[PDB]
Amino acid sequence: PAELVDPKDRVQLRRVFGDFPTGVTVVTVGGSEPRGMTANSFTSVSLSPPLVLICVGKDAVMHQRLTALPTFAVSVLEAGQEKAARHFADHSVDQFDTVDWVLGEESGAPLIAGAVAHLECAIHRLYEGGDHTIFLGEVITATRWPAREGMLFSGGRFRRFAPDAD
Amino acid sequence: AELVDPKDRVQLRRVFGDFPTGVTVVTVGGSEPRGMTANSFTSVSLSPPLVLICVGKDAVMHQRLTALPTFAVSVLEAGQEKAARHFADHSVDQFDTVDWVLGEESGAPLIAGAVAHLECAIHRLYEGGDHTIFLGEVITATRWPAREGMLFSGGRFRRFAPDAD
Ligand SMILES: [Ca+2]
Ligand SMILES: [Ca+2]
Ligand SMILES: [Ca+2]
Ligand SMILES: [Cl-]
Ligand SMILES: [Cl-]
Ligand SMILES: [Mg+2]
């Protein structure tokens, strides 16, 4: 039975936003106090120049970091990394002593070990996005592990792929 | 590990495909209604309620979106690969192979059987390299809770495993 959504109702809006499935990333930065934040707003944008974007809430600490720093990293989380996804979504101590990570050579940001891919990006534009800021980054380098497959987030829940039937 | 040269578009597409997404069909109305398959759909903001899509500068839909006040997004359900392929084909009624309903608010075709329809007003146009980023405000939406979206990952259509919980 179809549910009509009142866009002013944020409970309902979050329900419909949840209808579009995504992967899950952890965005990280270096600097004097490196930080990570779980993000599903990651979107690949352009091939030439190679661009991606993320949308970050204005009240997140990560927002203040990204506005101040020239680069960030994206770690696309693999199917078995729900613990890492939850950890970097916690609002609440080294944030990174729970997880295995390797230093990003271009971003100076911790890259999450076990990820499907790492992308290190230079911040190119900041665009207004309502209660978020849209950060457009140019991909400086990336590394991927072809054997790995991403975790999923849909309907407000973490989910898994069915193995490819072809 | 595979090191990716970002200037190599084959490699770059491989890494872009490592982030799984759903699949939408973006539609517009007007004299010549049009649809295009898009996975760059992203929900952005709660207040105001905003979403974005990234559309190639050379796409025919690109000119529509820069000109028209509204568009619709149909989030495709798990069994809708045929519609995804159809609205991604480059080469004429585009809507004679799908079940669709006119959206009252957008004036654009809404794809039947979808997980959700979102009808949006174009809010901003932002530079996005070889794409334009279209930011839209959600005017109304309808959803079907029992449905689940189709998935696109590694350049292939995929489906969910049953929720363990
Ligand atoms: Ca209400
Ligand atoms: Ca090459
Ligand atoms: Ca559902
Ligand atoms: Cl809220
Ligand atoms: Cl290409
Ligand atoms: Mg996205």
Side-chain angles (χ1 to χ4, degrees), chain A residues 1-7 9-32 34 36-63 65-82 84-92 94-165, chain B residues 1-6 8-31 33-62 64-80 83-89 93-165:
Chain A
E3 169 195 341
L4 176 70
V5 174
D6 172 8
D9 189 288
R10 292 155 71 122
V11 171
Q12 286 200 302
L13 190 63
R14 280 164 69 160
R15 287 187 186 135
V16 74
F17 283 176
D19 287 327
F20 182 79
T22 68
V24 184
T25 75
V26 175
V27 174
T28 56
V29 296
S32 295
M37 188 194 78
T38 298
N40 77 328
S41 64
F42 173 81
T43 302
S44 45
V45 175
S46 171
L47 295 183
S48 299
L51 306 178
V52 302
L53 67 77
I54 54 179
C55 301
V56 179
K58 287 172 175 177
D59 294 327
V61 165
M62 174 62 66
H63 188 277
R65 301 285 204 276
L66 292 167
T67 64
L69 297 170
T71 59
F72 63 91
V74 178
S75 298
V76 175
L77 296 183
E78 184 272 337
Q81 297 189 294
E82 175 175 343
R86 292 185 187 277
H87 177 67
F88 287 105
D90 189 350
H91 188 94
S92 303
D94 188 352
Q95 195 188 18
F96 290 94
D97 55 26
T98 275
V99 65
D100 276 8
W101 56 273
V102 299
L103 181 63
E105 292 164 1
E106 296 298 327
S107 62
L111 307 175
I112 309 305
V116 186
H118 294 152
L119 299 86
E120 294 176 79
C121 304
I123 292 169
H124 261 33
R125 298 284 186 280
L126 267 64
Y127 292 137
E128 292 175 325
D131 58 22
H132 283 51
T133 296
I134 299 169
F135 293 88
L136 185 66
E138 179 172 350
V139 180
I140 303 311
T141 190
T143 293
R144 64 188 294 268
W145 286 262
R148 296 174 182 164
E149 185 158 87
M151 59 178 305
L152 301 170
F153 181 52
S154 180
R157 299 179 182 281
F158 293 133
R159 295 291 300 273
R160 261 186 152 79
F161 284 108
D164 198 347
Chain B
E2 158 183 0
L3 178 63
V4 170
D5 172 7
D8 187 284
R9 288 157 65 132
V10 169
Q11 286 199 295
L12 187 65
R13 284 167 62 162
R14 283 185 197 136
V15 71
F16 283 178
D18 283 334
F19 181 76
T21 70
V23 183
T24 74
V25 174
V26 171
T27 58
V28 290
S31 27
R34 191 82 189 150
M36 183 194 33
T37 300
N39 79 321
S40 57
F41 174 84
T42 301
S43 49
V44 177
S45 173
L46 298 181
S47 196
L50 302 182
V51 298
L52 63 77
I53 54 176
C54 302
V55 177
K57 288 178 171 171
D58 288 328
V60 61
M61 165 78 56
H62 186 279
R64 304 300 178 93
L65 286 179
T66 70
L68 296 175
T70 57
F71 63 98
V73 176
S74 296
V75 176
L76 296 186
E77 184 268 344
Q80 301 191 295
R85 296 192 146 97
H86 176 74
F87 289 104
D89 136 273
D93 180 10
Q94 207 183 10
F95 291 89
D96 61 13
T97 76
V98 298
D99 190 1
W100 63 273
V101 172
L102 178 73
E104 302 294 342
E105 190 59 58
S106 64
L110 309 180
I111 310 297
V115 188
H117 298 146
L118 297 85
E119 298 180 83
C120 303
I122 294 274
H123 194 61
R124 298 272 168 87
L125 272 61
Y126 294 137
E127 288 189 302
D130 61 25
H131 288 51
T132 299
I133 301 161
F134 293 89
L135 187 62
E137 179 175 345
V138 181
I139 305 306
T140 185
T142 293
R143 61 183 301 264
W144 284 262
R147 297 180 181 157
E148 302 196 319
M150 64 180 302
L151 297 166
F152 181 54
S153 183
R156 296 195 309 254
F157 294 134
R158 298 288 301 280
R159 59 177 55 240
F160 285 103
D163 192 346
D165 301 305

